[PDB]
Amino acid sequence: KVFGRCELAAAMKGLDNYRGYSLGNWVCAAKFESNFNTQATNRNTDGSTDYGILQINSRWWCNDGRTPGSRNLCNIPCSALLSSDITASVNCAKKIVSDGNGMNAWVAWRNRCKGTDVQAWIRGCRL
Numbered sequence: 584k585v586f587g588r589c590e591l592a593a594a595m596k597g598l599d600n601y602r603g604y605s606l607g608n609w610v611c612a613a614k615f616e617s618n619f620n621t622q623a624t625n626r627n628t629d630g631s632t633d634y635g636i637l638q639i640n641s642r643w644w645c646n647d648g649r650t651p652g653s654r655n656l657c658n659i660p661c662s663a664l665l666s667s668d669i670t671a672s673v674n675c676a677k678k679i680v681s682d683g684n685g686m687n688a689w690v691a692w693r694n695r696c697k698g699t700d701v702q703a704w705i706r707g708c709r710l
């Protein structure tokens with residue numbers, strides 16, 4: 584499913600201020616990571632693949648059966664992250680952001696959202 588900006592903001596309300604990260608941060612990250620598409624996938628040079636709305640990596644967070652010697656920290660099949668229901672992605676993201684590096688785990692966030700006015704991403708949305 585391809586979400587709308589305000590539609591996604593409402594769907595990710597459980598991430599608002601999670602670990603000190605305001606909602607605009609998550610919406611900004613989703614936009615630049617997947618362009619709001621739950622079905623987005625991208626293969627990486629190391630052989631791992633990124634899945635879904637938040638482009639969660641198979642080397643650490645989920646199992647896709649083709650990333651040898653990887654971890655499955657969120658204990659889920661990577662395909663579960665492609666669902667129109669973003670719950671699985673939201674739940675796994677919470678573990679990721681708690682792992683020590685915060686939102687820096689998302690390269691697009693680090694490069695395009697960090698230090699910008701992320702509040703603009705939820706402008707006009709009735710939350």
Ligand SMILES: CC(=O)N[C@@H]1[C@@H](O)[C@H](O[C@@H]2O[C@H](CO)[C@@H](O[C@@H]3O[C@H](CO)[C@@H](O)[C@H](O)[C@H]3NC(C)=O)[C@H](O)[C@H]2NC(C)=O)[C@@H](CO)O[C@H]1O
Pocket residue numbers: 633637638639640641642643644656679682683684688689690
């Ligand atoms: C959204 C997404 O999938 N992002 C991926 C990143 O998670 C990944 O970064 C690597 O992540 C692991 C797990 O969080 C990092 O290891 C952790 O490092 C912290 C140090 O602050 C430590 O406290 C944790 O114990 C340790 N986790 C465990 C379970 O061992 C690791 O530092 C990250 N590596 C890099 C190079 O930053 C990157 C790299 O695979 O990919 C993103 O797609």
